[PDB]
């Protein structure tokens, strides 16, 4: 179909999650989540799919792609597909997690959409971790500001061909 974005927050470190959590507390990042996938399809792994709260998934306003290998997964308000490919069918998508979802899409990926959390969390076993970019990566670095908590962010706009 089209248009591959990853979309993710992590610390200055790359730490994404830890103890099955995002490891900040953000409100402004929900916003910046909705406002980039809104009207769009969002793919998920069903590991994150299950993390999610029963009465919150699936997501409003996004068709939520789940990918599985089980096909009696019951995904209530969302679609199942058994391939990546086939979670990419739609005009722009948005991958959401998690890692093992990362690596299977990040090679049909042209936009990256990031927020750096300005907390000092450095890597642990069992951490959840960014994607890794590149030199082929370009795009805007922004700068930083204050959420109404203090806690300091930032976003990253990145694009490839
Ligand atoms: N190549 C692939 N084909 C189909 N489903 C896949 C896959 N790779 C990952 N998945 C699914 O995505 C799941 C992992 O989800 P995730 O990416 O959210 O997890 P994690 O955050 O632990 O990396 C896998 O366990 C698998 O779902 P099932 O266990 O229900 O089969």
Same mark, same amino acid.
């Given at each position: 179909?089209?248009?591959?974005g990853?979309?993710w927050?992590q610390?200055?470190?790359?730490?994404?999650?830890?103890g099955?959590?995002?490891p900040?507390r953000?409100?402004?990042?929900?916003?910046?989540?909705?406002?980039?996938?809104?009207?769009?399809?969002?793919?998920?792994?069903r590991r994150?799919?299950?993390?999610?709260?029963?009465?919150?998934?699936?997501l409003?306003?996004?068709?939520?792609?789940?990918?599985?290998?089980?096909?009696?997964?019951m995904?209530? $308000?969302?679609?199942?597909?058994g391939?990546?490919?086939? +979670?990419?069918?739609s005009? !722009? &998508? #948005?991958?959401?997690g998690g /890692?093992?979802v990362?690596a299977?899409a990040l090679?049909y990926?042209?936009?990256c959409?990031?927020?750096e959390?300005d907390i $000092?969390?450095?890597?642990?076993?069992g951490?959840?971790? +960014?994607?890794?970019?590149? !030199? &082929? #990566?370009?795009?805007?670095? /922004?700068?930083?500001?204050f959420?109404?908590?203090?806690?300091?962010?930032?976003?990253?706009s990145?694009?490839?061909?």
């Amino acid at each position: 179909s089209h248009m591959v974005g990853l979309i993710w927050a992590q610390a200055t470190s790359g730490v994404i999650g830890r103890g099955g959590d995002i490891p900040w507390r953000l409100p402004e990042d929900q916003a910046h989540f909705r406002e980039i996938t809104m009207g769009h399809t969002i793919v998920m792994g069903r590991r994150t799919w299950d993390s999610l709260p029963a009465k919150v998934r699936p997501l409003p306003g996004r068709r939520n792609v789940v990918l599985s290998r089980q096909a009696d997964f019951m995904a209530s $308000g969302a679609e199942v597909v058994g391939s990546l490919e086939e +979670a990419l069918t739609s005009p !722009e &998508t #948005w991958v959401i997690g998690g /890692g093992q979802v990362y690596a299977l899409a990040l090679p049909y990926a042209t936009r990256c959409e990031v927020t750096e959390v300005d907390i $000092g969390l450095p890597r642990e076993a069992g951490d959840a971790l +960014a994607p890794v970019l590149d !030199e &082929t #990566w370009r795009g805007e670095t /922004g700068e930083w500001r204050f959420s109404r908590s203090g806690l300091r962010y930032r976003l990253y706009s990145y694009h490839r061909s």
